[PDB]
Design an enzyme around this catalytic site. Structure first.
Site, PDB file in Angstrom:
ATOM      1  N   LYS A 198       0.828  -1.192   0.000  1.00  0.00           N
ATOM      2  CA  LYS A 198       0.000   0.000   0.000  1.00  0.00           C
ATOM      3  C   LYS A 198       0.871   1.254   0.000  1.00  0.00           C
ATOM      4  CE  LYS A 198      -4.347  -1.395   0.107  1.00  0.00           C
ATOM      5  NZ  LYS A 198      -5.081  -0.353  -0.648  1.00  0.00           N
ATOM      6  N   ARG A 232      -4.991 -10.163   3.215  1.00  0.00           N
ATOM      7  CA  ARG A 232      -5.135 -10.147   1.760  1.00  0.00           C
ATOM      8  C   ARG A 232      -3.848  -9.589   1.177  1.00  0.00           C
ATOM      9  NH1 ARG A 232      -6.893  -6.701  -2.370  1.00  0.00           N
ATOM     10  NH2 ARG A 232      -8.037  -7.864  -3.984  1.00  0.00           N
TER      11      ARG A 232
END
Lengths: 265, 265
Positions: free
Chosen positions: A208, A243
């Protein structure tokens, strides 16, 4: 310790589980199927199939993900999740063998609430500020924890009123979706507080942007060590599914963690 | 926040510090110096120079490490540690610019205790079962924590009697050295117990065979993700220095840790 009944494929949540990311974007079906199977061999306990990248039309999304779900369902035994926010794709994916719905919009799309209820599979309620395709450019929060909590409380309530059973619900704090680096790290540090909602928590911080801001890695593929650190911390603070893109690396880290946790204090 | 005065080079221990591993083994000198410089630019706060691989003679050990220490001392501002158990190597390395001694034998080699006391640089007291060059095939412990504790207590007292000030002492649990994977996980899990000794704790599990046993990875360079996880856990449980091959990866993980821990509970 709970477990998910993913349309017959049981997933125990006694320890953290790894969800591999399988994005189907331009044949492309065989490549995606191969990619999922390779993540399974790396240790993935479940796969997340998504067709979004211009937002994708329902017909194209269905053309992208349905063959990959059909084939993976027949060629692996792990639960197959459909990564969509659209009711038609939810209904069709479940009919093609999906046993889980992973929805970035939190069943807020028109008809999604009732459609997901009727499938009978577990559903992950994600928090995002904004709408699919239009995330807030300058996200703002008085208290990011309290607002994310309040949102989840009300989506869980809507799900219950729409006919869901509690065993079929998960939450996702939605790291990265309409959140600054400060919002993300604050949610991750205080993420244990969301366990009071009483549903399993899924965490996704794979590569991210906030991890890159903190480490100075502009390239997303250079963010593997930080993703492993992030998902370990998420797991320590109560996330029971992670995830990830980097499955083998996350799997290896969780093995170190499980061995450490097995030592009696 | 405590700190080490490494022969004038201050090392603050308000957060975990990363020690880079620089093994000088067969121009091998120019290669090792370049490698040390690279670990620094990847973020290493200090470097550990060692000449062991079959035991190495003192004449050869000095020929290997002294040029590497002299040059690295002149081209970086970071502390240079000498990885040795031998008194002559300690004296020569410190006189050549080393500002720390990292001793697998816990100053138990004949003359080591007095030699290191006289150098005035911080010294890491490691625990190992066995002797340098002859590691135990079947390590055994009635109580690995209590026995590692008792050992370290006695090395600290012997160092105390030899004239050390406390600011010049660290402990190292010696993961892997006369220990099964089970012993390592027990020590790592209960490592916070050793903060009661009141000295900084150094942890080294980089690419260790026990990580391969836990993950199934035979190749040591395939063990980065597990090394990152192990060292993060070690830092969470009180280690303030980690000794690693994969510096940039460990730094990235520790920055994520520090950002999470900066959030107020």
């Amino acid at each position: 310790s709970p477990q998910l009944d993913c349309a017959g494929r049981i997933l125990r949540l006694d320890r953290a589980r790894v969800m591999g990311i399988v994005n189907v974007t331009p044949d492309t079906t065989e490549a995606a199927v191969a990619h999922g199977l390779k993540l399974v061999e790396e240790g993935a306990d479940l796969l997340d199939i998504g067709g979004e990248s211009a937002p994708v039309s329902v017909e194209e999304e269905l053309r992208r993900v349905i063959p990959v779900i059909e084939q993976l369902a027949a060629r692996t035994r792990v639960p197959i999740s459909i990564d969509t926010f659209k009711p038609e794709v939810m209904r069709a994916a479940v009919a093609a063998g999906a046993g889980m719905i992973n929805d970035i919009y939190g069943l807020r799309q028109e008809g999604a609430l009732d459609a997901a209820a009727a499938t009978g599979v577990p559903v992950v309620l994600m928090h995002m500020q904004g709408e699919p395709g239009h995330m807030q450019a300058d996200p703002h929060y008085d208290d990011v924890v309290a607002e994310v909590h309040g949102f989840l409380v009300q989506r869980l309530f809507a799900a219950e009123m729409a006919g869901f059973a509690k065993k079929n619900l998960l939450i996702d704090l939605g790291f990265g979706f309409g959140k600054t680096t400060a919002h993300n790290m604050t949610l991750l540090a205080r993420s244990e507080r969301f366990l009071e909602l009483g549903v399993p928590m899924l965490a996704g911080l794979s590569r991210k942007r906030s991890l890159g801001e903190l480490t100075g890695r502009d390239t997303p593929s250079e963010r593997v060590a930080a993703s492993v650190a992030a998902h370990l911390i998420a797991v320590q603070r109560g996330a029971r599914i992670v995830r990830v893109h980097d499955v083998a690396a996350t799997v290896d880290a969780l093995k170190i963690w499980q061995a450490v946790e097995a030592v009696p204090t």
